[PDB]
Every structure is written in structure tokens, then in C-alpha cells.
């Protein structure tokens, strides 16, 4: 129920100039739509929806990092074989080759770290009761065991 208003606010920064005004103080009625049935069950612990919102920012962050750390990886071949030193010069190609053989193996080791992030993202989703039996235990084997091969 909340979401339409989210899109409303988002646009003025999301295109900056491309959008922001296909919606507005749309939020004021959209926020009401959100909470209606949380309140119908009563729920003596309603504020707790805050944490459901936290996951969204996290999902973004994991992809972002998976990308950025990703990008960084390509750029080490660039400051490891290509251009960097001084303002960026030609002979850096083979000055860096002193380093060049070295950067390759280091790079290899670390990118393995990046792929655990796909799974970190996934782990956000897996125990968040979106068609799942685990919920910090609960009869059924962890998901941990399920995906590996």
C-alpha cells in the first residue's frame, strides 16, 4: 500500500530533471494505504515494519558492491597493466609489468569473495518468509545445505 508514494518522492532525485513531478505529496495518502490491515489484525507490535524496509536498502547495497567490487577488478588490470602512474603515460605499460605478473593472481583470489555476495543477497530473501519453511530453524533442513551443487 505504501509503495506509490515511494515512487513519488523518488522521482525528483531519480531523474533529477528527468522526473519528480509525475507524482508529489502523493505520499500523504499512500502512507495511509500501507498501514490499514496491519492495524486490522491489531498487531500490538506495528512499528516493526521498519525492519522490512531496511532489507530493501540492503538488497541494493549488495548488488551495488557486487558491481563496484566487480568494476574495481577490471580496473586493477588497468592500473596493473595499462594506465595509471603520473597523469597516465605510455611506458607505464612496462613499468607496471614489474607489477603486472603479480596483480593477476591477487585479483583471482579476491573475486571469489565477490560471488558470496550473490548468495548474501539471496540470504536476505531466503529466511524472509516468502515461501520458506526455515525461520531460524523450524522442521526442515537449512537452505544452507540445499543450494550448494
Amino acid at each position: 500500500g505504501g509503495l506509490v508514494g515511494v515512487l513519488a518522492l523518488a522521482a525528483s532525485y531519480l531523474g533529477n530533471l528527468q522526473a519528480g513531478w509525475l507524482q508529489g505529496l502523493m505520499y500523504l495518502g499512500f502512507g495511509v494505504f500501507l498501514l490499514a490491515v496491519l492495524m486490522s489484525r491489531i498487531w500490538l507490535m506495528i512499528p516493526e515494519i521498519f525492519t522490512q524496509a531496511g532489507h530493501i536498502l540492503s538488497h541494493i547495497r549488495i548488488y551495488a558492491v557486487g558491481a563496484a567490487g566487480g568494476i574495481l577488478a577490471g580496473l586493477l588490470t588497468d592500473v596493473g597493466f595499462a594506465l595509471a602512474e603520473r597523469l597516465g603515460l605510455l611506458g607505464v605499460l612496462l613499468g607496471l609489468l614489474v607489477a603486472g605478473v603479480l596483480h593477476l593472481l591477487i585479483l583471482l583470489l579476491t573475486t571469489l569473495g565477490h560471488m558470496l555476495q550473490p548468495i548474501r543477497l539471496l540470504w536476505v530473501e531466503f529466511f524472509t518468509k516468502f515461501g520458506f519453511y526455515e525461520e531460524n530453524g523450524r522442521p526442515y533442513r537449512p537452505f544452507k545445505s540445499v543450494r550448494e551443487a
Binding site: 533529477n16 536498502l57 540492503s58 540470504w123 536476505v124 526455515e134 525461520e135 531460524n136 530453524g137 544452507k144
Partner: protein, 76 residues
């Protein structure tokens, strides 16, 4: 774009602090709760969802900081 100045600078300045304050808080926070899990797992392998649950969580603070840091760009 265009020559800097102290006002532009004031907004330019704050961008690192926003990410940094939030980032620092997530790491220290993660270090004690995060620390708690290896023994729990060891003792009770079944208990892992908790260990696993501790680490994700402080990290929301850093995400907020970065957002403030970003927003200043495109207003700087």
C-alpha cells in the same frame, strides 16, 4: 562543474562524513554481535540462522550515510 568555493565546499565536505559515520558504526556494531556467532555455531550447528542474522543488520546505517553523501552530489 565550475570553480569551487566555500559554500559549494560546505556541501562537498559533508559527503565523506555521511558515509563514514554510518560505516564506522556498522563495523564496530557488527564486530561484537558478529563475533558472538562462531561459538554458537560450534556448539549448535543448528543455531546458524542467528549467527548469520547478526552480521547483515548494523550495516543499514552505512547505507543511509552513502545516500546522504550521494544526494549532495546533484546539488553541489
Amino acid at each position: 562543474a565550475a570553480s569551487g568555493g566555500l559554500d559549494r565546499g560546505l556541501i562537498a565536505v559533508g559527503m565523506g562524513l555521511a558515509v563514514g559515520l554510518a560505516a564506522l558504526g556498522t563495523g564496530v556494531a557488527q564486530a561484537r554481535i558478529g563475533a558472538a556467532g562462531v561459538g554458537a555455531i560450534a556448539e549448535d550447528r543448528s543455531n546458524f540462522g542467528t549467527a548469520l542474522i547478526f552480521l547483515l543488520l548494523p550495516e543499514t546505517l552505512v547505507i543511509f550515510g552513502l545516500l546522504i553523501a550521494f544526494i549532495l552530489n546533484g546539488r553541489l
